[PDB]
Amino acid sequence: VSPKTRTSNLKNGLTIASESNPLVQTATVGVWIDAGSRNENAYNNGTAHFFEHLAFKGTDKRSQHQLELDIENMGGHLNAYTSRESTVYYAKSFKDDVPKSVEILADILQHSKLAESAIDREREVITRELEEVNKQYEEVVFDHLHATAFMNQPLGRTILGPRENIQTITNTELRKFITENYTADRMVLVGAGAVDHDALVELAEKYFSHLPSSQSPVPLGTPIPNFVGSEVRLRDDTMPVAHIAIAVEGVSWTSEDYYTALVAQAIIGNYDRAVGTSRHQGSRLSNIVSENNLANSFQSFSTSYSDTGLWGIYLTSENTTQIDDLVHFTLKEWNRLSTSVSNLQVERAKSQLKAGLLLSLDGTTYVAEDIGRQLTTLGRRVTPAEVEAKLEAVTEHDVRAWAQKTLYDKDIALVGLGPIEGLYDYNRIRNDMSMMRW
Amino acid sequence: MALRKKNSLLNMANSYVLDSPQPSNLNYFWNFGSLLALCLVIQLATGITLAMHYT
Amino acid sequence: MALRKKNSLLNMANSYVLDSPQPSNLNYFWNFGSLLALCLVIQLATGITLAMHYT
Amino acid sequence: GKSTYKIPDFTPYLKKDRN
Amino acid sequence: FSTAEAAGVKVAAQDGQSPISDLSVVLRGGSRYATVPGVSHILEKFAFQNTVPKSALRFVRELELFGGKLYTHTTREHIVLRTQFLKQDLPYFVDAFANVLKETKFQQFELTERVAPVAELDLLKRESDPAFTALEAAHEVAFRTGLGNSVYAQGYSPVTLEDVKEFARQVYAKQNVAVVGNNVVPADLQQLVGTAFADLQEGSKVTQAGTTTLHGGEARVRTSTGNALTIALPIAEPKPVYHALASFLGGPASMPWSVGASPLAQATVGTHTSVKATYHNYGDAGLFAITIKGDSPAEISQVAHKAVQALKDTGAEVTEEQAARAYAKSKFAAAEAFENPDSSASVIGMELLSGVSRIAPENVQKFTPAELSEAAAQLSASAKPVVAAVGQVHALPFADEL
Amino acid sequence: FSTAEAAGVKVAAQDGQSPISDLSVVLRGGSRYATVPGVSHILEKFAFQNTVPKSALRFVRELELFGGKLYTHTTREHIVLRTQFLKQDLPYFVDAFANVLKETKFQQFELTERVAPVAELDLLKRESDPAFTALEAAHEVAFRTGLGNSVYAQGYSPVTLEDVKEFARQVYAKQNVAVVGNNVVPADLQQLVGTAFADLQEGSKVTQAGTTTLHGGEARVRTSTGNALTIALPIAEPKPVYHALASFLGGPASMPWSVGASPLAQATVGTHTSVKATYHNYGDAGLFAITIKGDSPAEISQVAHKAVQALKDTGAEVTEEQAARAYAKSKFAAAEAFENPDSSASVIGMELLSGVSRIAPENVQKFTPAELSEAAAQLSASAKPVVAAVGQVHALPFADEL
Amino acid sequence: ASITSVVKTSELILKSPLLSKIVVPLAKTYVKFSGYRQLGFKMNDLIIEETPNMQLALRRLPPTESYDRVYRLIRATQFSLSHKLATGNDITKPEEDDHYLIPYILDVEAEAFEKDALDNLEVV
Ligand code: HEM
Ligand code: HEM
Ligand SMILES: CCCCCCCCCCCCO[C@@H]1O[C@H](CO)[C@@H](O[C@H]2O[C@H](CO)[C@@H](O)[C@H](O)[C@H]2O)[C@H](O)[C@H]1O
Ligand SMILES: CCCCCCCCCCCCO[C@@H]1O[C@H](CO)[C@@H](O[C@H]2O[C@H](CO)[C@@H](O)[C@H](O)[C@H]2O)[C@H](O)[C@H]1O
């Protein structure tokens, strides 16, 4: 039994959420914001990521250099990331260095200079990042996957934004974005590890009290996405490994089917030829793939957003003459979620998940990420007891029902990168989304 | 590996009528080959039937 | 590369009747396959001939 | 003409109620 | 972590308030104790293969029903086998470790088909990073044997089933095993290890064949897969001050999209190069390393000069501010190491096996500017500098240039 | 060999009484002059490719009608292109050389499909001998650049068509070309070279980028294909005494199924190892090497100790008998070198391209025991010893052990 | 049939004193009349190998055992085609008829059968 996550609000509507662990000596405090790239329009796409680069480029008090020094003198580090729906800024420190770190985070969020000179300098750094993501193949694949699945919609946009916008982002647009979006009712100050809740609340009252409140305060994790079955092929014969993602429209955080989709994902599961145990996994797809050397790896995923999701699999393979078999066998394994799954597979996957959802939470950063994610998507921390009950409620009948509505004979978004000559056209892939024998 | 590719007999059908790689831009004049196959089948079926009645 | 292996049509005959790798110890009972082929040929030749005279 | 994340225009053919 | 003893096996456990436990068996079986190059890597990869009571297959399928995970690694000092599971499943995992230590059938087919191929993929993945290669090469030059043995199995020196079986006969013994339990009730672990590991051989303490000798030199590994350069200084008397010095010199940035305020970080300005100072204590000898990776050999060379200069400048004077910055960065490094389960296990493992009482993060010594400058002075003026270059080696610096 | 000049090209010819003539073009284009690593090897392999007047195909088919043969090689100092034909066919071969120097179309497909693959097979065949690798590695350590550049094109550092074209623009010029004619009428060669090489660029003398610097060190080339060990000593002042010393120390047997009477030969007794002392003069620096190959790394190590001892013992005292034995072995080595067409060409090539008069075998100096012992003393007391180990490198000696 | 089945059933028979008393002499005569030893084969050389399991067991044979098996098959095939029998040292003596392959195939099959069982497990 984990210690209780305490939650308080301020007057502006900032949530403070903390989970203390008197066994560790380090703390992670940070701010989780319910805002990300999805909050931009087409003209200011890239702003949120731009701001992340400038948040560390100096404030009204501390210059860029002073900032660097202040953090170095703390001992820990700061980190930030921007996603489609979420922005995180956190500081890992020592137990008694928490007041410094909260003060620095409050400073970089509220009181950033955003000086024209620095905007101009980062505009080159970010421009170079456009031509170096190209190497991170999984990320390239997933970025195209969102672009095609949510064609011409806000979720379909990249985080970095187009080259054109990077050249035209001004301090004015940056200021406007963080004033409209980084509001107190959309922010959660999270502390995990060696933090006292009451101490953290006092620090919030001291530093985050003059945060803007939004005009219309909706609850945390409040959202219209129209999935497009489609494919992007980025053939590159010079690459040795093919990277393929297949996805269907999945489930939102607050779907009734959220846990059902996780169990279904666990029935297929993950595989990696480099891991010793992977040849012995119970998953049927794992067995087919390992026996036939069809793939180096596959990773099932179920990404959620506030109002939609993507559920699918990411495969990598050097076996370029049997990509057809890899895709064929994968989709026939999905078919069986509709036609064949019994309590056998369902109870096995529930067992694996009941632990997996707790095992993820190792160190203070993972705990803080869990509190922050849940508070900004569901509006509360879900206790392990509730999670265990929701998983227990998933029956074989629920999985079959869900798969038959979500996977069976549905349109897919498909992205292939690399030597994918052997990947058949869209129709033949999509035809494997059903079985004529059933 | 899929049965249609694994099994030698199935694989021959597969290579000719199913996975056979074709240019993507054949026009309607590439359809006479299959019509000639259809004519040949109709002539065999009708022909064998007439042979059952002809002296 | 030799023509019998290069040319697709020749290669099919080659793979069945010429380069086909056989066990080196087949005894005389492995000869009925070719006799059955010979019977089938004799029956086709004689059969078609009788059909030219039969009513 | 350069970015591969800018999906070409398919609006002439996309059905609104496709799902 | 309450250290105790259960049937001649040293057991250290710390109870906590979480649903997830980490049980780790730490073996005195790292590469410095290896008999044949690569055997400790192979022995690590042969854990949780077929035992007499339970096949690899059965183990994996049952571990999936408990939703446990299994993690193994080899260092120069230890083999670490760690399982992560729910608190209540402790007895299962204790018994599984016992089967591995007592009853592993080391079968030749497992070596050929399972263990060796996985060990080869492990190494290829690590070598994708040229900095890894450079720091490995540096240890090889500095120590030759013992600490200088490779940690990972290479294809050029094939490990045989007889090699692995022999080594395992020495390693898998009460004298070379420590059990470390994170979020495990200490009383309950002692009782279980006491029943399960009672029939394990006593054996003897594994020792390093030959004493640790330090040497200087160069290694020049021609790869086509990126460029790196390590500047190592072997240390004859390992002292805790070198931790402080490594953290002071620093190198990595402590905030995104920044360079950093550390002397080594400031050496990279205007280059797409990264730098990292590291200190490795191995009890009887140490290694202080500065590794530089980058895509440009010209930039690496440029940084390498600045890096050595930084160390010399440190030997001259450090300010009071800088010495306090070093204390802070070092306390933090110690804390996060004791938190990460991977490193945690090996830290208490060293306390249990060797007897080096652990330095708690709250007890990390504050070094004056005098003590730090003196340590850096002793490094700039070492008679045995090592330089390992990886990549376009014709374009990277040499020892006598630095 | 009567040295003369024909249209700005230095021509040396010696008429003889044989039906077989050897014409060699010696180019100042060896690896020490290489702009980029491997370019001189590629330029050598690009000789007798397509020229504008005559395709590679037509050349080969016509050379077969004359029954001529073509031989090319690259050293650190020269590229040598040699043709062997019947006396009467001289004009054809002169004109062919002229086409190669004036009119080679360096086409990218020839580089990709013809020249690079052949250069790669050339090197793989040489590396089959681990002694070759060891002596190559030793030059790399000793000199770094210039003489330290690789002679052969390696896969890790690719030569581009622009690299080869640039180098050829420098090399194929009147200033870097010498024509050497064995069993060629000297008057007739001058007349032909005078007409054929008149339109060749004058160009300028190719020079080594940077001065020759000597360094000590170690190289440890881990292979699976045999074991060897070179113990090299870079020489700052190349002197002719080192020839005598190399022949004295010897190593190869002068008799079948024997060990030999040379100190280094006597170091191999009871081992299936061979040993070979060599001295390489390169004008401005020299390299004295002792290479040991064998199948056993243990035996190699054992011999290596005896080998260094032998050198030290020589530094102590040489007998009069031993000094005379050295003179005899050295005169002979000089004679047979001037006979072998490959080495002959390069010897007069050096005389023509530099100005270093050849030492005729009849003029080889007799060194007293005093002079020989003094030279061996300088080598035993070198501040910069190089050791290159190839094979099971973990089992071979290190510099500080020797 | 599976080799596992054959081996288990044989062990049941060898356990029972009565059964072994009557079966072991019969099995010895059977093997003598079978006459595979007269072509210089060991019993295990005759087991059907065109199955994934058996292919895997053969790949796991020690190199020497494998090379020897190839020679016995080639030698027997030559006796077969010549209609000769082995003579002298080519005849397999009862002491040379060792079950070199049985351990390998039993391991391959053990895993394959465990895999089938575990594919049908039900969490209770
Ligand atoms: C390419 C295939 C064939 C073609 C092009 C073909 C063509 C013809 C033609 C042109 C006639 C004269 C039709 C008439 O005016 O009545 C005919 C008659 C006939 N064919 Fe075929 N035929 C074919 C295949 C066959 C086959 C396989 C049989 C099998 C026995 C067959 C049996 C007959 C018979 C019995 C008649 C005469 C009865 C009649 O005239 O209808 N045919 N065929
Ligand atoms: C496997 C091939 C064949 C078998 C086993 C077979 C068998 C027979 C048999 C048993 C008879 C009765 C013979 C008698 O007692 O007179 C017969 C008659 C006949 N068969 Fe076939 N036959 C074959 C192929 C053919 C073919 C291809 C034709 C082509 C038309 C053909 C045409 C005839 C005719 C016209 C007769 C009747 C005239 C007669 O009895 O001789 N047969 N066949
Ligand atoms: C159109 C009538 C329908 C019946 C089909 C025709 C029946 C007779 C066809 C068989 C003749 C041999 O046909 C030959 O077979 C093999 C496998 O089947 C094919 O082989 C092809 O496909 C297989 C996999 O699908 C690949 O291993 C191979 O690289 C490729 O070339 C040949 O391209 C084809 O030429
Ligand atoms: C029996 C009468 C004689 C006519 C031939 C019989 C017609 C049947 C042939 C049609 C079926 C296709 O036959 C198929 O073809 C290819 C090449 O031809 C063969 O392929 C085989 O031979 C070729 C070279 O000879 C190799 O490249 C290949 O590795 C090997 O498998 C197949 O083993 C065979 O199954």
Residue numbers in the entry:
A (entry chain L): 26 to 248, 260 to 474
B (entry chain N), C (entry chain C): 1 to 55
D (entry chain P): 39 to 57
E (entry chain M), F (entry chain B): 15 to 416
G (entry chain G): 2 to 125
Sentences from the paper on this structure:
The cytochrome bc 1 complex, also known as respiratory complex III (CIII), in the electron-transfer chain of the inner mitochondrial membrane is a homodimer (CIII2) of two biochemically identical protomers. CIII2 catalyses the transfer of electrons from the lipophilic two-electron donor ubiquinol (QH2) to the water-soluble, one-electron acceptor protein cytochrome c, contributing to an electrochemical proton gradient across the membrane. The Rieske domain is tethered to the complex by one transmembrane helix and a connecting flexible linker that acts as a hinge.
In intermediate positions, the tip of the Rieske domain is close to the ef-loop of cyt b. In the apo sample without antimycin A, density for Trp142 appeared to be very weak with partial occupancy in both positions. The densities of the cd 1-helix and the ef-loop were weaker and more difficult to model when the Rieske domain was in the intermediate position in CIII2 samples without added oxidant or reductant, indicating increased flexibility and heterogeneity.
